């Protein structure tokens, strides 16, 4: 497990690295083959009506400040950032054969849907809290709609309490359907209706662009790569003192097995004086 | 040759101690079969499981919690095979999957405390919410569905009404067929009431998610997602045919393992009885000493 998770760790580094270009694919969060699907479909764009637009991830970034919520909004949107677009059920049959022949293992959504720019400015959370869409920054405004339509972003607000996200829910707010609170750097929470609280486990991979340099997430993260050997050695050696404690068990039980051997073996040298006994000369004619 | 015997059928015995602890291992696990015996184990392989299953394990400790808090459909649910298992596990979300019921609001404030202060755990309240399929199970057959995906499951019927509220199972039809896209293209367009019959419904291997955008000129796109094989929820332990391709295969090479060892603890038995012979020909040796 621990070695998976320093690998992961590292192969993401270089990933942020490939965020231009490189080695190990930055797409890759995606699928391994993510760049030989986008070749394969710029190269057959004129046989589709319209190219197949994705996968949403890349098109969406994290706006300067919302760093912090990458995790818990990449949570919400996950079943969106995965998908890809397609105009017509035609382009959506194009587009399996071409998932087929790129050898995809990754389950990809394919959504049928007529691109447009609408005005959702009546459907917006209202509050004080700042909601996903103004967390995010959209390659085209038609793709920002798509995001409204999938996951209704407009009505999802960012609250950094538990406690605040859960009192402003249950108050009813106008087009609010859920509150997203942080927990910590690996879980956060999902408040529905004010009554429901779900405890969300972060995917480790990143599928959302953030605008801070891959530097700064890679070699943070390489302080944090030595901050996850410590995570390796805390996690295996609190196994290995929980093995130290019960192999002094096992060493306890060996001695009193030691001492149970002497005993048997005093006991094994006591019968052979007790044969030894019985094989002796006896004086006893004389006596007769 | 006696202690020498005694540490050989010691051994033997040490030997036939482990070739009978195997056998107890290799049993349970022919009879394991079917259902897991305790789901208490479910929750172990997991270290986000770990604090659901303490706290369960407290729940199962106060009486007074008992019937007032149940146990997640992990534990209490199970589909009538592997491949509705794969179905239900893709629609309940992961949170609910592992979330403790709670059967009422006071039962929420009297025990939600205490266990949301000790166990990181997810609650789910029962609500009076009506469970009514939205239309009857004769017509979804005519559309080529077997039925709710609610039909192919078991468990506590508290937890299952819990499940029909938060992932909505009663209105999804299951197909174990691949339904052809003329019926796929009539499911997805909408009534002349503007309305889609099914929000979500499963065929074959996927899950086809039927929105119908709250904005604009209310257009209605499918997404389609690929249903993922699952050991949670799962009723039918990996199907029959790969229970048998991992189970079995990895299991009867640990039982050849297990006939070797009982044979070669057979073998010591035989030597020992080639001692013992040996011993009771010469304790006849010592007899005929004695006489002389």
Not at chain 2, 143 to 160: A, Q
Request: glycine letters at 4%; proline letters at 3%; hydrophobic letters at 35%.
């Amino acid at each position: 497990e621990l070695r998976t998770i320093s690998r992961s760790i590292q192969n993401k580094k270089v990933e942020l690295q490939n965020i231009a270009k490189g080695n190990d694919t930055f797409l890759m969060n995606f699928d391994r083959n993510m760049d030989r699907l986008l070749r394969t479909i710029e190269q057959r764009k004129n046989e589709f009506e319209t190219p197949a637009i994705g996968p949403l991830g890349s098109l969406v970034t994290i706006r300067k400040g919302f760093e912090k919520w990458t995790r818990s909004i990449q949570r919400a949107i996950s079943s969106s950032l995965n998908a890809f677009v397609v105009s017509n059920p035609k382009d959506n049959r194009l587009f399996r054969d071409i998932m087929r022949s790129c050898g995809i293992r990754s389950n990809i959504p394919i959504v049928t849907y007529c691109l447009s720019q609408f005005d959702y400015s009546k459907g917006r959370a209202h509050g004080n809290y700042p909601t996903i869409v103004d967390a995010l920054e959209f390659s085209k405004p038609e793709i920002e709609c798509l995001f409204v339509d999938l996951s209704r972003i407009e009505r999802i607000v960012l609250i950094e309490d538990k406690n605040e996200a859960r009192n402003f829910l249950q108050r009813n707010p106008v087009n609010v359907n859920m509150a997203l609170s942080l927990r910590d750097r690996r879980s956060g929470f999902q408040l529905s209706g004010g009554y429901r609280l779900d405890t969300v486990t972060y995917q480790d991979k990143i599928r959302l662009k953030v605008n801070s340099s891959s530097d700064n997430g890679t070699q943070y993260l390489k302080d944090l790569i030595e901050q996850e050997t410590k995570e390796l050695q805390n996690i295996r050696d609190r196994y290995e003192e929980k093995l130290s404690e019960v192999r002094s068990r096992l060493k306890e039980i060996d001695g009193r097995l030691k001492s149970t051997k002497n005993e048997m073996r005093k006991t094994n040298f006591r019968m052979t004086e007790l044969k030894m006994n019985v094989g002796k000369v006896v004086d006893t004619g004389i006596l007769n | 040759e006696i202690r020498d015997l005694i540490s050989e059928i010691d051994a033997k015995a040490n030997a036939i101690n482990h070739e009978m602890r195997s056998i107890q291992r290799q049993a349970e696990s022919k009879t394991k079969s079917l259902t897991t015996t305790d789901k208490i184990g479910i929750l172990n392989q997991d270290q986000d499981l770990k604090e659901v299953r303490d706290a369960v394990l407290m729940v199962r400790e106060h009486p007074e919690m008992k019937d007032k808090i149940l146990e997640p459909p992990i534990m209490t649910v199970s589909a009538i095979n592997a491949q509705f298992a794969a179905y239900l596990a893709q629609c309940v979300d992961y949170n609910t999957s592992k979330a403790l019921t709670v059967v009422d609001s006071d039962s929420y404030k009297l025990f939600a405390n205490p266990i949301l202060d000790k166990f990181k755990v997810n609650l789910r309240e029962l609500s009076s919410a009506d469970t009514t399929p939205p239309v009857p199970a004769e017509t979804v057959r005519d559309l080529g569905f077997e039925g709710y995906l609610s039909d192919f499951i078991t468990g506590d019927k508290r937890v299952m009404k819990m499940l029909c509220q938060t992932s909505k199972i009663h209105t999804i039809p299951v197909s174990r067929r691949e339904l052809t896209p003329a019926q796929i293209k009539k499911l997805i367009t909408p009534r002349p009431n503007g309305k889609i019959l099914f929000k979500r419904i499963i065929h074959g291997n996927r899950l086809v998610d039927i929105k119908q955008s709250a904005y604009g000129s209310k257009q209605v796109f499918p997404t389609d997602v690929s249903i993922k094989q699952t050991n949670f929820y799962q009723g039918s332990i990996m199907s029959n045919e790969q229970k048998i391709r991992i189970e079995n295969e990895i299991i009867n090479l640990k039982n050849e393992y297990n006939d070797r060892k009982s044979t070669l603890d057979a073998l010591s038995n035989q030597k020992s009885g080639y001692r013992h012979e040996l011993s009771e020909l010469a304790s006849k040796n010592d007899d005929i000493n004695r006489e002389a």
